[PDB]
Enzyme design. Sequence first.
Site, PDB file in Angstrom:
ATOM      1  N   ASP A 649     -12.085 -23.326 -48.813  1.00 33.23           N
ATOM      2  CA  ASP A 649     -11.043 -23.654 -49.766  1.00 33.23           C
ATOM      3  C   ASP A 649     -10.922 -22.521 -50.775  1.00 33.23           C
ATOM      4  O   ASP A 649     -11.935 -22.010 -51.271  1.00 33.23           O
ATOM      5  CB  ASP A 649     -11.399 -24.977 -50.460  1.00 33.23           C
ATOM      6  CG  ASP A 649     -10.303 -25.483 -51.370  1.00 33.23           C
ATOM      7  OD1 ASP A 649      -9.216 -25.837 -50.859  1.00 33.23           O
ATOM      8  OD2 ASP A 649     -10.543 -25.547 -52.591  1.00 33.23           O
ATOM      9  N   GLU A 678      -8.286 -20.297 -46.791  1.00 35.49           N
ATOM     10  CA  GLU A 678      -6.936 -20.309 -47.324  1.00 35.49           C
ATOM     11  C   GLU A 678      -6.932 -19.757 -48.737  1.00 35.49           C
ATOM     12  O   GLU A 678      -7.848 -20.023 -49.520  1.00 35.49           O
ATOM     13  CB  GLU A 678      -6.344 -21.717 -47.340  1.00 35.49           C
ATOM     14  CG  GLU A 678      -4.830 -21.719 -47.540  1.00 35.49           C
ATOM     15  CD  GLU A 678      -4.287 -23.106 -47.811  1.00 35.49           C
ATOM     16  OE1 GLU A 678      -3.057 -23.286 -47.773  1.00 35.49           O
ATOM     17  OE2 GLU A 678      -5.106 -24.015 -48.073  1.00 35.49           O
TER      18      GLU A 678
END
EC number: 3.2.1.41
Length: 1055
Positions: A649, A678
């Site tokens: 994340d 991401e």
Amino acid sequence: DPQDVVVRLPDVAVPGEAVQASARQAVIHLVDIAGITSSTPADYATKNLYLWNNETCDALSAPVADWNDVSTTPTGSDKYGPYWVIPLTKESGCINVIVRDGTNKLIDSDLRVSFSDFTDRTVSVIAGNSAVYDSRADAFRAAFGVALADAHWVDKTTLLWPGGENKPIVRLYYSHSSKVAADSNGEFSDKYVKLTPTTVNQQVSMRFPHLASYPAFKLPDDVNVDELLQGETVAIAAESDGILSSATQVQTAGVLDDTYAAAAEALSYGAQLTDSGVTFRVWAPTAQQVELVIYSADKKVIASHPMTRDSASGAWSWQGGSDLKGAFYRYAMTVYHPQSRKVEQYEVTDPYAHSLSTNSEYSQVVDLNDSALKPEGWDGLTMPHAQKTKADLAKMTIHESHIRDLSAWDQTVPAELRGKYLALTAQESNMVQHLKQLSASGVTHIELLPVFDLATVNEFSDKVADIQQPFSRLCEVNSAVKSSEFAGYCDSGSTVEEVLTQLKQNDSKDNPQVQALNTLVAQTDSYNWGYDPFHYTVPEGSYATDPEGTARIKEFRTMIQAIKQDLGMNVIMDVVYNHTNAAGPTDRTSVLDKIVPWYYQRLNETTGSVESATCCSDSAPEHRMFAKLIADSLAVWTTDYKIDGFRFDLMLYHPKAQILSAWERIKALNPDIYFFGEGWDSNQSDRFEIASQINLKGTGIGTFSDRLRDAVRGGGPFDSGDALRQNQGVGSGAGVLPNELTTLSDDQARHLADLTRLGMAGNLADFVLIDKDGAVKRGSEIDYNGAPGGYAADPTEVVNYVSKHDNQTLWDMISYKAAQEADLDTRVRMQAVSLATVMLGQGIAFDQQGSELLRSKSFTRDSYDSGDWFNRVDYSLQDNNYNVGMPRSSDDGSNYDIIARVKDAVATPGETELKQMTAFYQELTALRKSSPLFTLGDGATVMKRVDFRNTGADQQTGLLVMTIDDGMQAGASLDSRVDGIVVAINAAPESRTLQDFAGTSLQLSAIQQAAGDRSLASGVQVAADGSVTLPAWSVAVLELPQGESQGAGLPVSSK
Ligand SMILES: OC[C@H]1O[C@@H]2O[C@H]3[C@H](O)[C@@H](O)[C@@H](O[C@H]4[C@H](O)[C@@H](O)[C@@H](O[C@H]5[C@H](O)[C@@H](O)[C@@H](O[C@H]6[C@H](O)[C@@H](O)[C@@H](O[C@H]7[C@H](O)[C@@H](O)[C@@H](O[C@H]1[C@H](O)[C@H]2O)O[C@@H]7CO)O[C@@H]6CO)O[C@@H]5CO)O[C@@H]4CO)O[C@@H]3CO
Ligand SMILES: [Ca+2]
Ligand SMILES: [Ca+2]
Ligand SMILES: [Ca+2]
Ligand SMILES: [Ca+2]
Ligand SMILES: [Ca+2]
């Protein structure tokens, strides 16, 4: 030292107030710091106030709008400065003031003085300072007292500080056991180290680039850092006469790393079972003492052990008996916390905890190797899918799932397993059978939303109420419902699920009642995505049948085993090392920042505050011992839980080096582990090279690509209101089936098609295609909102998707964007056409759980806390959860208008549409794995074999035609059955004919032929001459059958 000048406060009292405001009056003191140093009897004639009434602050009586008017001079003055008595029309609200000398502002900030915040309407200010103080004493202490924290002790001998610049006296004061403060004689008589100006060395400037411009200072080589770091340290600067110029707190993370990290990295941490017993170790290099507190199962203290400090590492250790296995424990810390400026005393769980009590209150000694904590066969559990070669990795097809989303609604899952890890063992359930079917058809990986220990679900089941339980229970556990407009249901006798169904009937944008009740439910239910880390290396407890102790460890492994062994899929974990759930010395879920304050959190360089750009309490993976915690954590998930890959994340909040370091550590354990992440919005490139899409090119670390995603979905995640409808995507008919609001031009539509083709070829920086204008462009030359479109070196570095847990589901996007004339069957094909761009593309394929079932969240954009109701996935195939109430008003309320306008265009999907979509979906995944050509893995190989037809300014809009060469020009024949493949996605309402393969022996793939009327290619015609007719909204995969040897195929053109 004899000859050192004593640093001291100015030789003047702390000021009281000059005047207090009376009725219909406010008072402003300007504390004249400069003239408080006296000498010159000052002159405040030119000091004046600029005062005006707007609509935010209007309590002034007769304000003078004229900026050139300087006649609002002080009402009076004393040796501490002037003051103004300002008439008011009321005593509530606020006034606007600018404090001036002539027309020059002495404070560069429109000041807001609110009477709610300062009830006596008597405030003080200083030049060069936007803060409003309630008293002159407060303002005085701000100017002559410790404030902020912009000094940075960055290695043994280097302190970086703006306040020291060109000051005669610069010193680092330190107090072991109290706050550095002026004594009764106004002097600072605590011990100090002297600092002399020096030059920012080259090792420091690399380490801390965002500080390299700070004025540098040297400490003598003799300094005993261990003694200073055990207490408060304050940088102090003073004039030649000794009067204080400023004082600030010191950020020590850099010197802690320089002093201790080398030794501390050589040690192992946590409660560790050895041959002779248990070794406990925690890193706490600033703690004054650490006691190991041992607890009985009932949480009684049964022993308490002062630990042994290692002076080289700053780690504390203690060795005890092997009967401590299973024992609960905490570390009793005595440690200075700069946030509170107190030597704190508190017990903290182990950051290296591998087992926990209920709700993570106590850590627990565990040996994860114990066969009692393993399901039978665990040690021989193998990867069902290879991840070794780039062609192995490219076959990855991910199904992103959540423990409750899987099973909370499935009546065929035994009730005690719903919302639990073990639901994956219910072999006969609808949910597991559906997953087995998806696996057989070519989904290869399950990606799990947070299953480490999250903070935001209460693991004490008595404190939780879920929608399947009586409404009375919800009232018992949630005292807000009594005071809510739903109080009358406490005695209703029905469940919360039944009440929410009843609220559906008259739910509207005017009466958003479903969402109203759900927001209360959300506070005390079992539901959260869980991006809220409490302990990084323990499974979450609420997903276990028994959260008390080690039980969760075996249930987690039993789940992992069932997924790999019964379902045939690899497992990816979402991990969240970029922030902690909390920080500071008081909050329940502050673990890391209680044990080593201000080391594990990223701080603001001026204030020392924990940054919140991630959402929460930003972490510091650039610091060596947090990097080690991350790597050690991943090692446990890799070895002890047999996790096949990790999704970081907000990975761009991590240094590229740290991610690569972590990856090299794990590859030594297991060479085939896949890392990806991401990231979009890291402002951290000033501190280090961030781990971003651009900087990770060539590294083999994967990144989610937002390129194809936005092009096929339409628009972007920040759209709201009408923009949600106007911004159609390739999958929803941009430029070919316009809705009533859009103004997408053909050029705009073709630009989306460029991004989509580029993504289907793996979003490579160097891939060469013909763009919307017929011009030759490299992938990096396709614009994506400013950025270079293509960024990857290999397609395994790119994860394509059109739906994910965050932002709206694909179906809800199609519902927003689809033209009124697109009927329900057409929207189902829009969903499959959208997913075809991902599934048939060269990038790694990723999809949200339930896209194959047209999953809806009732237009919820951000459903992390929207409970079982909006996140429902019905594996009984009754409906897709569409139209179950307006979404939460706090995040989607400005979309209520466009929602009400689009929502009822067509019927809600039912069992017939769900089955058709699942067939479409399994058709697509089966095609993806039907040939190695779909998953080439290697960027250079993609560049040699993948091309496109129907390109340029006169392309038929919405028709994507990709060719994959397996003939002689490409090299070897990677597929014995075909010399080439054609992928044709006709995202358009017109039937289309391809002549590009005329006379070529092209034929439809056997998979699609076998699906017949149920195929995405139903109705495709291949004529004798090799012309291909594509129905509207269709996907066809065609092939050139191979002969006795490698034929000519579909050669890429040299553009
Ligand atoms: O006046 C209407 C104004 O109302 C509110 O502004 C407040 C403001 O918040 C206060 O700070 C103060 O404004 C002071 C300035 O603080 C002070 O420095 C000086 O401003 C000078 C500027 O530094 C200089 O650039 C120039 O201003 C120009 C400006 O460049 C032009 O673009 C134009 O300004 C217009 C604004 O663009 C417009 O937003 C609006 O201003 C509002 C504002 O939204 C609100 O916050 O209107 C103005 C034009 O009416 O023209 C000016 C020059 O005329 O020169 C000035 C030196 O005069 O002075 C201002 C106040 O005069 O107080 C105002 C409320 O009075
Ligand atoms: Ca006061
Ligand atoms: Ca938890
Ligand atoms: Ca919740
Ligand atoms: Ca920053
Ligand atoms: Ca071949």
